[PDB]
Structure formats: C-alpha cells, structure tokens
C-alpha cells in the first residue's frame, strides 16, 4: 500500500532538511515530495517579493492541486510548516489522508491564525532567539518582518542533537524568512467544515529547545489530535537528529 508523503519545512529552512528522511520513506516503498516554499531553499523568489502567507505557501498549494482524483497524500510539517499544512487542509481537505504536525504550530478553526503565535510569545522569553536578527521589509504602510537565524541559536537551540555537519549545512543554506504575523492577523481563519475535517496527528520532539515540549503538549491538549507520537531525543530538527524515528512514527501514523 504505497503512500505519498508531502514534506513541509519550517521558517528559514528548505526542502533540504528532509534529505535523510526522504530516502528512508522511499526505501520503505513510498512516494515523497519535499517542497521548497517561496524564497526558501533554492526557490527563486526573493523574500522581499513575498508579502502574504498565501504567496509564501504557494509551492505547497501547487503540489496539492496536482494530486489526481484517485489519490490522497500524507502531510508532514515541522515548526512554522504547520501553518502551511493548515492552509492545504482548508483548501484541499479531501486530498489528505492525515496531516502530521511535528514540533509544530497546529491551527485551531475556532481561533484566528495569529493565536498560536500570541500563545508562543506568552510562554517564551523575548530573547529566545539568541543571535537571530530581524528587520522590517516591504511597504512602510504595512511592514513585513524578516528574520535570519543566528549561528548560535541554530547550534544551541535547533541542531543541538545533530552532527556538526548538519549544523554546517544549515549555516550554508538558511535564508531570510518571515512568520507573516500581520498578514495572518488579517487572513480568514480556517473552518471546522474544511480544515477541521482532516485527520490530525502530532509528533513530539522532547528535546526541542526552540519550541519546548510543554508547548507542543499545549497544542495537543487544547486542539487535539487523533494520534500522537513522541521522539524522546529529537531536537527541533528531528528529521536530522532522529530520521529513523521520524520515519517509524510517520509509517505508524499512516498505515
């Protein structure tokens, strides 16, 4: 029974983060699409020409639109990748067998699209991103906010359980990104009819220092998932620190 996994990266990363998980899923016999969102990875757009969350997510939407009538996909997204899942879920609910959120923001159709971020801010210190730097971009009447991950933040708070090779790869590949907060503040929210009809799964990364477990648990407790799994020694980048475990969870959740 072949599955088609669509993998979705978080902010400032790209499809390349899945380079270890993708062959493990293909070895198991499945199809995998690892997408670069706009201005991520080797996607040719520049961040300063991306002003909406919809524009940002468009490469995932193109994958979603090209799934044939016979078919469904399994979605996996980490970190801010969860917001793009939510948009795919709202738009193509019938094309998705299960949406898996790994150490990610899991939207709630009862709240606005900013609420997860407001809740983040509420539980996490304003200095949580260490040497990351932020600057406004776009139109001065509604400015966007871009971020670049600092090498210390990445070393200590994202890749602390990964090899130095993976952290190095990351420093060579990471690009400016945005959480699109003021765009999301104006977006229509997801609905129980569409988004809320899709089966959800959650995978905990217990050693994630950028998105603490009490937080991931809050998502599960306040929104709920049909299936939850935990990877005890995954950092924020569980697909790199624990690719076999992620693959094991993903195959359990799907089969």
């Amino acid at each position: 029974q072949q599955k088609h996994f669509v993998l979705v990266h978080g902010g400032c990363l790209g499809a390349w983060i899945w380079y270890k998980l993708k062959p493990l899923l293909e070895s198991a016999g499945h199809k995998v699409t690892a997408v670069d969102l706009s201005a991520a990875g080797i996607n040719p757009r520049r961040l300063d020409e991306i002003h909406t969350f919809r524009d940002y997510s468009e490469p995932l939407m193109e994958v979603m639109a090209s799934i044939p009538p016979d078919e469904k996909v399994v979605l996996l997204g980490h970190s801010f990748g969860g917001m793009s899942l939510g948009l795919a879920m709202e738009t193509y609910p019938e094309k998705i067998s299960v949406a898996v959120f790994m150490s990610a923001m899991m939207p709630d159709p009862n709240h606005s699209l900013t609420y997860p971020f407001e809740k983040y801010n509420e539980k996490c210190p304003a200095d949580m991103m260490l040497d990351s730097q932020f600057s406004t971009y776009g139109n001065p009447e509604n400015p966007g906010m871009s971020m670049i991950l600092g090498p210390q933040f990445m070393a200590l708070k994202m890749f602390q359980n990964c090899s130095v090779e993976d952290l190095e790869l990351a420093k060579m590949l990471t690009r400016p990104g945005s959480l699109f907060f003021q765009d999301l503040a104006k977006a229509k929210k997801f609905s129980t009819e569409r988004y809320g009809s899709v089966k959800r799964a959650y995978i905990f990364c217990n050693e994630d220092k950028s998105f603490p477990v009490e937080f991931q648990k809050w998502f599960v407790e306040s929104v709920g998932a049909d299936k939850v799994k935990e990877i005890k020694e995954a950092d924020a980048m569980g697909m790199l620190s624990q690719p076999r475990e992620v693959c094991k969870c993903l195959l359990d959740i799907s089969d």
Side-chain angles (χ1 to χ4, degrees), residues 77-86 101-108 113-121 179 195 202 211 215-216 218-219 223:
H78 98 302
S79 169
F80 187 54
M83 300 305 297
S84 287
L85 262 55
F101 300 79
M102 180 173 60
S103 311
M105 306 245 185
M106 202 183 296
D108 185 348
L113 306 176
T114 56
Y115 175 82
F117 305 93
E118 294 171 320
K119 286 285 152 164
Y120 198 74
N121 285 176
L179 300 188
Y195 170 96
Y202 208 90
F211 198 60
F215 228 78
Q216 295 171 51
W218 175 81
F219 276 105
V223 170

PDB file of all heavy atoms in Angstrom, residues 77-86 101-108 113-121 179 195 202 211 215-216 218-219 223:
ATOM      1  N   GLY A  77       4.670  18.361   8.556  1.00  0.00           N
ATOM      2  CA  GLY A  77       5.288  19.653   8.630  1.00  0.00           C
ATOM      3  C   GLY A  77       5.833  19.906  10.000  1.00  0.00           C
ATOM      4  O   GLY A  77       5.246  19.502  10.987  1.00  0.00           O
ATOM      5  N   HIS A  78       6.963  20.597  10.056  1.00  0.00           N
ATOM      6  CA  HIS A  78       7.525  20.928  11.332  1.00  0.00           C
ATOM      7  C   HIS A  78       7.475  22.439  11.548  1.00  0.00           C
ATOM      8  O   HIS A  78       7.443  23.221  10.583  1.00  0.00           O
ATOM      9  CB  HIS A  78       8.925  20.254  11.512  1.00  0.00           C
ATOM     10  CG  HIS A  78      10.078  21.142  11.225  1.00  0.00           C
ATOM     11  ND1 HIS A  78      10.248  21.767  10.008  1.00  0.00           N
ATOM     12  CD2 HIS A  78      11.117  21.529  12.003  1.00  0.00           C
ATOM     13  CE1 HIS A  78      11.325  22.531  10.057  1.00  0.00           C
ATOM     14  NE2 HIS A  78      11.869  22.400  11.255  1.00  0.00           N
ATOM     15  N   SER A  79       7.360  22.837  12.821  1.00  0.00           N
ATOM     16  CA  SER A  79       7.644  24.200  13.195  1.00  0.00           C
ATOM     17  C   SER A  79       6.631  25.054  12.393  1.00  0.00           C
ATOM     18  O   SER A  79       5.489  24.629  12.291  1.00  0.00           O
ATOM     19  CB  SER A  79       9.131  24.451  12.937  1.00  0.00           C
ATOM     20  OG  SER A  79       9.500  25.809  13.017  1.00  0.00           O
ATOM     21  N   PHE A  80       6.989  26.203  11.824  1.00  0.00           N
ATOM     22  CA  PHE A  80       6.026  27.091  11.087  1.00  0.00           C
ATOM     23  C   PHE A  80       5.377  26.372   9.881  1.00  0.00           C
ATOM     24  O   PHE A  80       4.306  26.809   9.343  1.00  0.00           O
ATOM     25  CB  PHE A  80       6.802  28.335  10.633  1.00  0.00           C
ATOM     26  CG  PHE A  80       5.960  29.442  10.002  1.00  0.00           C
ATOM     27  CD1 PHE A  80       4.870  29.987  10.647  1.00  0.00           C
ATOM     28  CD2 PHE A  80       6.346  30.000   8.781  1.00  0.00           C
ATOM     29  CE1 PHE A  80       4.099  31.017  10.038  1.00  0.00           C
ATOM     30  CE2 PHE A  80       5.596  31.022   8.174  1.00  0.00           C
ATOM     31  CZ  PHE A  80       4.462  31.527   8.809  1.00  0.00           C
ATOM     32  N   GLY A  81       5.983  25.232   9.486  1.00  0.00           N
ATOM     33  CA  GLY A  81       5.426  24.369   8.440  1.00  0.00           C
ATOM     34  C   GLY A  81       3.996  23.946   8.709  1.00  0.00           C
ATOM     35  O   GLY A  81       3.272  23.590   7.792  1.00  0.00           O
ATOM     36  N   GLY A  82       3.589  23.961   9.979  1.00  0.00           N
ATOM     37  CA  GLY A  82       2.242  23.646  10.379  1.00  0.00           C
ATOM     38  C   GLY A  82       1.189  24.588   9.878  1.00  0.00           C
ATOM     39  O   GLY A  82       0.067  24.171   9.588  1.00  0.00           O
ATOM     40  N   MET A  83       1.526  25.867   9.771  1.00  0.00           N
ATOM     41  CA  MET A  83       0.592  26.834   9.180  1.00  0.00           C
ATOM     42  C   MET A  83       0.263  26.575   7.711  1.00  0.00           C
ATOM     43  O   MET A  83      -0.866  26.755   7.312  1.00  0.00           O
ATOM     44  CB  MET A  83       1.092  28.279   9.346  1.00  0.00           C
ATOM     45  CG  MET A  83       1.267  28.682  10.833  1.00  0.00           C
ATOM     46  SD  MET A  83      -0.198  28.464  11.884  1.00  0.00           S
ATOM     47  CE  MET A  83      -1.391  29.619  11.115  1.00  0.00           C
ATOM     48  N   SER A  84       1.257  26.170   6.922  1.00  0.00           N
ATOM     49  CA  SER A  84       1.063  25.760   5.531  1.00  0.00           C
ATOM     50  C   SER A  84       0.220  24.495   5.375  1.00  0.00           C
ATOM     51  O   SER A  84      -0.620  24.430   4.507  1.00  0.00           O
ATOM     52  CB  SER A  84       2.432  25.615   4.842  1.00  0.00           C
ATOM     53  OG  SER A  84       2.973  26.922   4.624  1.00  0.00           O
ATOM     54  N   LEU A  85       0.449  23.482   6.196  1.00  0.00           N
ATOM     55  CA  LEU A  85      -0.470  22.351   6.324  1.00  0.00           C
ATOM     56  C   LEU A  85      -1.889  22.835   6.552  1.00  0.00           C
ATOM     57  O   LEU A  85      -2.810  22.414   5.878  1.00  0.00           O
ATOM     58  CB  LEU A  85      -0.078  21.468   7.522  1.00  0.00           C
ATOM     59  CG  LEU A  85       0.758  20.205   7.261  1.00  0.00           C
ATOM     60  CD1 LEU A  85       2.053  20.606   6.489  1.00  0.00           C
ATOM     61  CD2 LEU A  85       1.084  19.497   8.520  1.00  0.00           C
ATOM     62  N   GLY A  86      -2.090  23.707   7.526  1.00  0.00           N
ATOM     63  CA  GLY A  86      -3.422  24.191   7.810  1.00  0.00           C
ATOM     64  C   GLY A  86      -4.085  24.783   6.565  1.00  0.00           C
ATOM     65  O   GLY A  86      -5.291  24.544   6.323  1.00  0.00           O
ATOM     66  N   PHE A 101       1.685  16.954  12.315  1.00  0.00           N
ATOM     67  CA  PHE A 101       2.407  18.122  12.844  1.00  0.00           C
ATOM     68  C   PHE A 101       3.532  17.635  13.766  1.00  0.00           C
ATOM     69  O   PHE A 101       3.269  17.061  14.786  1.00  0.00           O
ATOM     70  CB  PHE A 101       1.444  19.024  13.631  1.00  0.00           C
ATOM     71  CG  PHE A 101       0.310  19.540  12.792  1.00  0.00           C
ATOM     72  CD1 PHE A 101      -0.780  18.723  12.514  1.00  0.00           C
ATOM     73  CD2 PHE A 101       0.326  20.849  12.287  1.00  0.00           C
ATOM     74  CE1 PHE A 101      -1.831  19.189  11.731  1.00  0.00           C
ATOM     75  CE2 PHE A 101      -0.716  21.312  11.505  1.00  0.00           C
ATOM     76  CZ  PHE A 101      -1.784  20.488  11.218  1.00  0.00           C
ATOM     77  N   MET A 102       4.791  17.886  13.393  1.00  0.00           N
ATOM     78  CA  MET A 102       5.903  17.560  14.245  1.00  0.00           C
ATOM     79  C   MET A 102       6.578  18.768  14.888  1.00  0.00           C
ATOM     80  O   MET A 102       7.176  19.576  14.185  1.00  0.00           O
ATOM     81  CB  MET A 102       6.934  16.791  13.479  1.00  0.00           C
ATOM     82  CG  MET A 102       8.138  16.415  14.338  1.00  0.00           C
ATOM     83  SD  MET A 102       9.259  15.338  13.442  1.00  0.00           S
ATOM     84  CE  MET A 102       9.672  16.396  12.053  1.00  0.00           C
ATOM     85  N   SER A 103       6.561  18.845  16.224  1.00  0.00           N
ATOM     86  CA  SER A 103       7.020  20.038  16.909  1.00  0.00           C
ATOM     87  C   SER A 103       6.580  21.267  16.096  1.00  0.00           C
ATOM     88  O   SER A 103       7.411  22.093  15.728  1.00  0.00           O
ATOM     89  CB  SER A 103       8.533  20.107  17.114  1.00  0.00           C
ATOM     90  OG  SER A 103       9.053  18.894  17.671  1.00  0.00           O
ATOM     91  N   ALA A 104       5.286  21.389  15.864  1.00  0.00           N
ATOM     92  CA  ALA A 104       4.747  22.451  15.022  1.00  0.00           C
ATOM     93  C   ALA A 104       3.528  23.136  15.594  1.00  0.00           C
ATOM     94  O   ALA A 104       2.864  22.652  16.524  1.00  0.00           O
ATOM     95  CB  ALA A 104       4.387  21.874  13.678  1.00  0.00           C
ATOM     96  N   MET A 105       3.224  24.271  14.993  1.00  0.00           N
ATOM     97  CA  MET A 105       2.050  25.035  15.271  1.00  0.00           C
ATOM     98  C   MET A 105       0.899  24.293  14.623  1.00  0.00           C
ATOM     99  O   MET A 105       0.875  24.087  13.414  1.00  0.00           O
ATOM    100  CB  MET A 105       2.182  26.438  14.639  1.00  0.00           C
ATOM    101  CG  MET A 105       3.463  27.195  15.054  1.00  0.00           C
ATOM    102  SD  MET A 105       2.969  28.639  15.995  1.00  0.00           S
ATOM    103  CE  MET A 105       4.459  29.552  16.321  1.00  0.00           C
ATOM    104  N   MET A 106      -0.086  23.919  15.430  1.00  0.00           N
ATOM    105  CA  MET A 106      -1.255  23.245  14.896  1.00  0.00           C
ATOM    106  C   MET A 106      -2.466  24.184  14.985  1.00  0.00           C
ATOM    107  O   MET A 106      -2.950  24.427  16.092  1.00  0.00           O
ATOM    108  CB  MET A 106      -1.521  21.977  15.718  1.00  0.00           C
ATOM    109  CG  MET A 106      -2.345  20.974  14.965  1.00  0.00           C
ATOM    110  SD  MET A 106      -2.835  19.469  15.792  1.00  0.00           S
ATOM    111  CE  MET A 106      -1.363  18.692  16.091  1.00  0.00           C
ATOM    112  N   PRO A 107      -2.965  24.715  13.842  1.00  0.00           N
ATOM    113  CA  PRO A 107      -4.050  25.692  13.971  1.00  0.00           C
ATOM    114  C   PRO A 107      -5.339  25.128  14.549  1.00  0.00           C
ATOM    115  O   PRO A 107      -5.558  23.914  14.528  1.00  0.00           O
ATOM    116  CB  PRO A 107      -4.281  26.147  12.519  1.00  0.00           C
ATOM    117  CG  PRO A 107      -3.034  25.882  11.845  1.00  0.00           C
ATOM    118  CD  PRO A 107      -2.441  24.669  12.468  1.00  0.00           C
ATOM    119  N   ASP A 108      -6.192  26.039  15.014  1.00  0.00           N
ATOM    120  CA  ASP A 108      -7.479  25.750  15.595  1.00  0.00           C
ATOM    121  C   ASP A 108      -8.477  26.616  14.836  1.00  0.00           C
ATOM    122  O   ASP A 108      -8.329  27.849  14.815  1.00  0.00           O
ATOM    123  CB  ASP A 108      -7.451  26.167  17.068  1.00  0.00           C
ATOM    124  CG  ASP A 108      -8.744  25.793  17.848  1.00  0.00           C
ATOM    125  OD1 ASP A 108      -9.765  25.418  17.228  1.00  0.00           O
ATOM    126  OD2 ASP A 108      -8.747  25.897  19.107  1.00  0.00           O
ATOM    127  N   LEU A 113      -5.641  33.123  12.932  1.00  0.00           N
ATOM    128  CA  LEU A 113      -4.409  32.430  12.550  1.00  0.00           C
ATOM    129  C   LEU A 113      -3.218  32.948  13.347  1.00  0.00           C
ATOM    130  O   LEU A 113      -2.182  32.327  13.370  1.00  0.00           O
ATOM    131  CB  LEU A 113      -4.149  32.478  11.028  1.00  0.00           C
ATOM    132  CG  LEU A 113      -5.309  31.961  10.189  1.00  0.00           C
ATOM    133  CD1 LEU A 113      -4.977  32.153   8.704  1.00  0.00           C
ATOM    134  CD2 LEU A 113      -5.558  30.536  10.526  1.00  0.00           C
ATOM    135  N   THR A 114      -3.366  34.082  14.020  1.00  0.00           N
ATOM    136  CA  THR A 114      -2.264  34.594  14.885  1.00  0.00           C
ATOM    137  C   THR A 114      -2.178  33.980  16.308  1.00  0.00           C
ATOM    138  O   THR A 114      -1.172  34.101  16.954  1.00  0.00           O
ATOM    139  CB  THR A 114      -2.296  36.120  15.027  1.00  0.00           C
ATOM    140  OG1 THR A 114      -3.557  36.536  15.520  1.00  0.00           O
ATOM    141  CG2 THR A 114      -2.034  36.841  13.680  1.00  0.00           C
ATOM    142  N   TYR A 115      -3.217  33.297  16.757  1.00  0.00           N
ATOM    143  CA  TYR A 115      -3.347  32.914  18.153  1.00  0.00           C
ATOM    144  C   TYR A 115      -2.234  31.997  18.662  1.00  0.00           C
ATOM    145  O   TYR A 115      -1.747  32.209  19.752  1.00  0.00           O
ATOM    146  CB  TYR A 115      -4.741  32.340  18.377  1.00  0.00           C
ATOM    147  CG  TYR A 115      -5.038  31.765  19.746  1.00  0.00           C
ATOM    148  CD1 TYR A 115      -5.411  32.563  20.809  1.00  0.00           C
ATOM    149  CD2 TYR A 115      -5.017  30.408  19.936  1.00  0.00           C
ATOM    150  CE1 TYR A 115      -5.712  31.995  22.048  1.00  0.00           C
ATOM    151  CE2 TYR A 115      -5.336  29.846  21.120  1.00  0.00           C
ATOM    152  CZ  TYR A 115      -5.666  30.614  22.182  1.00  0.00           C
ATOM    153  OH  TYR A 115      -5.968  29.953  23.370  1.00  0.00           O
ATOM    154  N   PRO A 116      -1.793  31.016  17.844  1.00  0.00           N
ATOM    155  CA  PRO A 116      -0.661  30.183  18.150  1.00  0.00           C
ATOM    156  C   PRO A 116       0.600  31.015  18.463  1.00  0.00           C
ATOM    157  O   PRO A 116       1.404  30.623  19.304  1.00  0.00           O
ATOM    158  CB  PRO A 116      -0.433  29.434  16.816  1.00  0.00           C
ATOM    159  CG  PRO A 116      -1.772  29.366  16.204  1.00  0.00           C
ATOM    160  CD  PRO A 116      -2.378  30.690  16.524  1.00  0.00           C
ATOM    161  N   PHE A 117       0.788  32.115  17.743  1.00  0.00           N
ATOM    162  CA  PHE A 117       1.979  32.963  17.874  1.00  0.00           C
ATOM    163  C   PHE A 117       1.883  33.817  19.115  1.00  0.00           C
ATOM    164  O   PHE A 117       2.853  33.950  19.876  1.00  0.00           O
ATOM    165  CB  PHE A 117       2.199  33.786  16.591  1.00  0.00           C
ATOM    166  CG  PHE A 117       2.288  32.924  15.369  1.00  0.00           C
ATOM    167  CD1 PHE A 117       1.155  32.650  14.609  1.00  0.00           C
ATOM    168  CD2 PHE A 117       3.499  32.317  15.013  1.00  0.00           C
ATOM    169  CE1 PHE A 117       1.231  31.799  13.517  1.00  0.00           C
ATOM    170  CE2 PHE A 117       3.593  31.474  13.910  1.00  0.00           C
ATOM    171  CZ  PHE A 117       2.458  31.204  13.171  1.00  0.00           C
ATOM    172  N   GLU A 118       0.694  34.363  19.356  1.00  0.00           N
ATOM    173  CA  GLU A 118       0.424  35.086  20.593  1.00  0.00           C
ATOM    174  C   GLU A 118       0.666  34.185  21.806  1.00  0.00           C
ATOM    175  O   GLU A 118       1.267  34.586  22.781  1.00  0.00           O
ATOM    176  CB  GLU A 118      -0.974  35.701  20.565  1.00  0.00           C
ATOM    177  CG  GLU A 118      -1.084  36.814  19.459  1.00  0.00           C
ATOM    178  CD  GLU A 118      -2.517  37.334  19.225  1.00  0.00           C
ATOM    179  OE1 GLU A 118      -3.480  36.522  19.238  1.00  0.00           O
ATOM    180  OE2 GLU A 118      -2.670  38.565  18.991  1.00  0.00           O
ATOM    181  N   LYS A 119       0.198  32.961  21.737  1.00  0.00           N
ATOM    182  CA  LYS A 119       0.443  31.982  22.797  1.00  0.00           C
ATOM    183  C   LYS A 119       1.925  31.635  22.965  1.00  0.00           C
ATOM    184  O   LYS A 119       2.416  31.456  24.060  1.00  0.00           O
ATOM    185  CB  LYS A 119      -0.431  30.750  22.532  1.00  0.00           C
ATOM    186  CG  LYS A 119      -1.886  31.037  22.859  1.00  0.00           C
ATOM    187  CD  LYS A 119      -2.043  31.058  24.397  1.00  0.00           C
ATOM    188  CE  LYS A 119      -3.180  31.950  24.849  1.00  0.00           C
ATOM    189  NZ  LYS A 119      -3.518  31.611  26.303  1.00  0.00           N
ATOM    190  N   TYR A 120       2.646  31.545  21.860  1.00  0.00           N
ATOM    191  CA  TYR A 120       4.124  31.420  21.882  1.00  0.00           C
ATOM    192  C   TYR A 120       4.883  32.517  22.616  1.00  0.00           C
ATOM    193  O   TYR A 120       5.840  32.284  23.413  1.00  0.00           O
ATOM    194  CB  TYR A 120       4.642  31.353  20.450  1.00  0.00           C
ATOM    195  CG  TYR A 120       6.039  30.792  20.349  1.00  0.00           C
ATOM    196  CD1 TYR A 120       6.258  29.442  20.519  1.00  0.00           C
ATOM    197  CD2 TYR A 120       7.133  31.604  20.083  1.00  0.00           C
ATOM    198  CE1 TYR A 120       7.529  28.914  20.409  1.00  0.00           C
ATOM    199  CE2 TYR A 120       8.437  31.058  19.973  1.00  0.00           C
ATOM    200  CZ  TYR A 120       8.593  29.694  20.125  1.00  0.00           C
ATOM    201  OH  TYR A 120       9.814  29.055  20.028  1.00  0.00           O
ATOM    202  N   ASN A 121       4.480  33.719  22.279  1.00  0.00           N
ATOM    203  CA  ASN A 121       5.065  34.900  22.819  1.00  0.00           C
ATOM    204  C   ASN A 121       4.826  34.846  24.321  1.00  0.00           C
ATOM    205  O   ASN A 121       5.708  35.180  25.117  1.00  0.00           O
ATOM    206  CB  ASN A 121       4.372  36.122  22.199  1.00  0.00           C
ATOM    207  CG  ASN A 121       4.796  36.392  20.783  1.00  0.00           C
ATOM    208  OD1 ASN A 121       4.264  37.306  20.128  1.00  0.00           O
ATOM    209  ND2 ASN A 121       5.788  35.666  20.305  1.00  0.00           N
ATOM    210  N   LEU A 179       7.495  35.035   9.507  1.00  0.00           N
ATOM    211  CA  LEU A 179       6.330  34.401  10.072  1.00  0.00           C
ATOM    212  C   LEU A 179       5.024  35.044   9.650  1.00  0.00           C
ATOM    213  O   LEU A 179       3.975  34.616  10.107  1.00  0.00           O
ATOM    214  CB  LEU A 179       6.416  34.440  11.586  1.00  0.00           C
ATOM    215  CG  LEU A 179       7.648  33.708  12.137  1.00  0.00           C
ATOM    216  CD1 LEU A 179       7.526  33.631  13.643  1.00  0.00           C
ATOM    217  CD2 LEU A 179       7.865  32.326  11.522  1.00  0.00           C
ATOM    218  N   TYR A 195     -10.834  22.573   7.065  1.00  0.00           N
ATOM    219  CA  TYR A 195      -9.643  22.242   7.870  1.00  0.00           C
ATOM    220  C   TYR A 195      -9.915  21.221   8.932  1.00  0.00           C
ATOM    221  O   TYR A 195      -9.144  20.275   9.104  1.00  0.00           O
ATOM    222  CB  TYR A 195      -9.074  23.500   8.553  1.00  0.00           C
ATOM    223  CG  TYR A 195      -8.009  23.196   9.590  1.00  0.00           C
ATOM    224  CD1 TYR A 195      -6.646  23.243   9.269  1.00  0.00           C
ATOM    225  CD2 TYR A 195      -8.351  22.859  10.896  1.00  0.00           C
ATOM    226  CE1 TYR A 195      -5.662  22.948  10.242  1.00  0.00           C
ATOM    227  CE2 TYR A 195      -7.380  22.579  11.850  1.00  0.00           C
ATOM    228  CZ  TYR A 195      -6.040  22.624  11.510  1.00  0.00           C
ATOM    229  OH  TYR A 195      -5.080  22.336  12.452  1.00  0.00           O
ATOM    230  N   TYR A 202       0.110  14.310  15.776  1.00  0.00           N
ATOM    231  CA  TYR A 202       1.165  15.138  16.367  1.00  0.00           C
ATOM    232  C   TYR A 202       2.342  14.244  16.715  1.00  0.00           C
ATOM    233  O   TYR A 202       2.174  13.156  17.269  1.00  0.00           O
ATOM    234  CB  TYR A 202       0.692  15.896  17.631  1.00  0.00           C
ATOM    235  CG  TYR A 202       1.458  17.192  17.841  1.00  0.00           C
ATOM    236  CD1 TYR A 202       1.012  18.388  17.287  1.00  0.00           C
ATOM    237  CD2 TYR A 202       2.653  17.208  18.530  1.00  0.00           C
ATOM    238  CE1 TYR A 202       1.733  19.580  17.458  1.00  0.00           C
ATOM    239  CE2 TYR A 202       3.386  18.369  18.664  1.00  0.00           C
ATOM    240  CZ  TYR A 202       2.922  19.558  18.123  1.00  0.00           C
ATOM    241  OH  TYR A 202       3.622  20.740  18.312  1.00  0.00           O
ATOM    242  N   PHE A 211      11.133  25.258  20.667  1.00  0.00           N
ATOM    243  CA  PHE A 211       9.698  25.051  20.738  1.00  0.00           C
ATOM    244  C   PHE A 211       9.473  23.991  21.805  1.00  0.00           C
ATOM    245  O   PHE A 211       9.270  22.830  21.478  1.00  0.00           O
ATOM    246  CB  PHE A 211       9.169  24.525  19.380  1.00  0.00           C
ATOM    247  CG  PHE A 211       7.692  24.691  19.219  1.00  0.00           C
ATOM    248  CD1 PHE A 211       7.086  25.970  19.271  1.00  0.00           C
ATOM    249  CD2 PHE A 211       6.892  23.593  19.052  1.00  0.00           C
ATOM    250  CE1 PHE A 211       5.678  26.119  19.235  1.00  0.00           C
ATOM    251  CE2 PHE A 211       5.491  23.746  18.928  1.00  0.00           C
ATOM    252  CZ  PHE A 211       4.899  24.981  18.993  1.00  0.00           C
ATOM    253  N   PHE A 215       4.933  23.222  25.327  1.00  0.00           N
ATOM    254  CA  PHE A 215       4.208  23.962  24.315  1.00  0.00           C
ATOM    255  C   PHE A 215       3.535  23.071  23.317  1.00  0.00           C
ATOM    256  O   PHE A 215       2.410  23.325  22.919  1.00  0.00           O
ATOM    257  CB  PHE A 215       5.199  24.701  23.474  1.00  0.00           C
ATOM    258  CG  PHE A 215       4.842  25.972  23.316  1.00  0.00           C
ATOM    259  CD1 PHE A 215       5.106  26.730  24.380  1.00  0.00           C
ATOM    260  CD2 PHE A 215       4.246  26.466  22.146  1.00  0.00           C
ATOM    261  CE1 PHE A 215       4.812  27.947  24.370  1.00  0.00           C
ATOM    262  CE2 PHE A 215       3.909  27.714  22.136  1.00  0.00           C
ATOM    263  CZ  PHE A 215       4.182  28.471  23.307  1.00  0.00           C
ATOM    264  N   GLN A 216       4.264  22.037  22.887  1.00  0.00           N
ATOM    265  CA  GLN A 216       3.788  21.116  21.896  1.00  0.00           C
ATOM    266  C   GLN A 216       2.612  20.401  22.539  1.00  0.00           C
ATOM    267  O   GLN A 216       1.603  20.107  21.868  1.00  0.00           O
ATOM    268  CB  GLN A 216       4.893  20.122  21.568  1.00  0.00           C
ATOM    269  CG  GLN A 216       6.154  20.718  20.903  1.00  0.00           C
ATOM    270  CD  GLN A 216       7.256  19.709  20.813  1.00  0.00           C
ATOM    271  OE1 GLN A 216       7.044  18.598  20.325  1.00  0.00           O
ATOM    272  NE2 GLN A 216       8.443  20.060  21.281  1.00  0.00           N
ATOM    273  N   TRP A 218       0.640  21.635  24.892  1.00  0.00           N
ATOM    274  CA  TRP A 218      -0.450  22.575  24.912  1.00  0.00           C
ATOM    275  C   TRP A 218      -1.250  22.440  23.628  1.00  0.00           C
ATOM    276  O   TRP A 218      -2.465  22.435  23.668  1.00  0.00           O
ATOM    277  CB  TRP A 218       0.050  24.015  25.147  1.00  0.00           C
ATOM    278  CG  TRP A 218      -1.052  25.028  25.057  1.00  0.00           C
ATOM    279  CD1 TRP A 218      -1.956  25.351  26.036  1.00  0.00           C
ATOM    280  CD2 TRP A 218      -1.387  25.827  23.922  1.00  0.00           C
ATOM    281  NE1 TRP A 218      -2.819  26.336  25.573  1.00  0.00           N
ATOM    282  CE2 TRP A 218      -2.484  26.646  24.286  1.00  0.00           C
ATOM    283  CE3 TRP A 218      -0.848  25.957  22.644  1.00  0.00           C
ATOM    284  CZ2 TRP A 218      -3.065  27.543  23.409  1.00  0.00           C
ATOM    285  CZ3 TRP A 218      -1.427  26.898  21.754  1.00  0.00           C
ATOM    286  CH2 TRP A 218      -2.519  27.657  22.148  1.00  0.00           C
ATOM    287  N   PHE A 219      -0.591  22.342  22.474  1.00  0.00           N
ATOM    288  CA  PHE A 219      -1.303  22.191  21.196  1.00  0.00           C
ATOM    289  C   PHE A 219      -2.179  20.950  21.210  1.00  0.00           C
ATOM    290  O   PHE A 219      -3.371  20.972  20.871  1.00  0.00           O
ATOM    291  CB  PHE A 219      -0.316  22.146  19.990  1.00  0.00           C
ATOM    292  CG  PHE A 219       0.094  23.530  19.503  1.00  0.00           C
ATOM    293  CD1 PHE A 219       1.344  24.050  19.790  1.00  0.00           C
ATOM    294  CD2 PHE A 219      -0.832  24.336  18.859  1.00  0.00           C
ATOM    295  CE1 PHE A 219       1.675  25.357  19.422  1.00  0.00           C
ATOM    296  CE2 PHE A 219      -0.508  25.638  18.456  1.00  0.00           C
ATOM    297  CZ  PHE A 219       0.754  26.143  18.731  1.00  0.00           C
ATOM    298  N   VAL A 223      -6.206  21.579  21.258  1.00  0.00           N
ATOM    299  CA  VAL A 223      -6.777  21.389  19.917  1.00  0.00           C
ATOM    300  C   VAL A 223      -7.151  19.876  19.701  1.00  0.00           C
ATOM    301  O   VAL A 223      -8.237  19.522  19.168  1.00  0.00           O
ATOM    302  CB  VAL A 223      -5.773  21.937  18.834  1.00  0.00           C
ATOM    303  CG1 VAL A 223      -6.170  21.561  17.417  1.00  0.00           C
ATOM    304  CG2 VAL A 223      -5.601  23.453  18.977  1.00  0.00           C
TER     305      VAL A 223
END
